[PDB]
């Protein structure tokens, strides 16, 4: 049996932001995502920004991974609102996560 209805609320005009280093591991990153997910729920615009070392020995393709690693948790609840790009000269990347404008929700009760 299930019981719990908070109420239909799109939420006020607020924006969230998240900043961390690539060093973050799976154990840690796991938490970072959870937080973002909860936000997206209320259609909260979350701005993510990955920071890399002084020209670390890695290409952009690597910096793109982290991003996906996060969206891989909310692939049916969130989407690449704003494609990630090279910011601050490429040393870092910025992106945002939003809700699936499409009628696709694989979380919660059988939406119908």
CATH superfamily for 14-99 is Translation initiation factor 3 (IF-3), C-terminal domain (3.30.110.10)
Q: What DSSP string describes the chain? A: ------------S-EEEEEEETT--HHHHHHHHHHHHHHHHTT-EEEEEEE--TT-S--HHHHHHHHHHHHTTSTTT-EEEEEEEEEGGGTEEEEEEE--SSS---SSS---
Instruction: Give the start-to-end residue ranges of the domains of the chain.
Output: 14-99
Instruction: Give the whole-angstrom CA distance, residue 87 versus residue 55.
Output: 13
Q: What is the largest CA-CA distance in the chain?
A: 54
């Amino acid at each position: 049996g299930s019981s719990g209805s908070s109420g239909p609320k799109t939420g006020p005009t607020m924006t969230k932001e998240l900043v961390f280093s690539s060093n973050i591991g799976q154990h840690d990153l796991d938490t970072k995502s959870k937080q973002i997910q909860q936000w997206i729920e209320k259609k909260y615009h979350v701005q993510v920004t990955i920071k890399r070392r002084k020209d670390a020995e890695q290409s952009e393709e690597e910096t793109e991974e982290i991003f996906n690693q996060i969206l891989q948790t909310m692939p049916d609840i969130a989407t690449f609102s704003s494609r990630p790009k090279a910011i601050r000269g490429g040393t870092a990347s910025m992106c945002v996560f939003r809700h699936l404008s499409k009628k696709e929700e694989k979380s919660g009760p059988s939406s119908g």
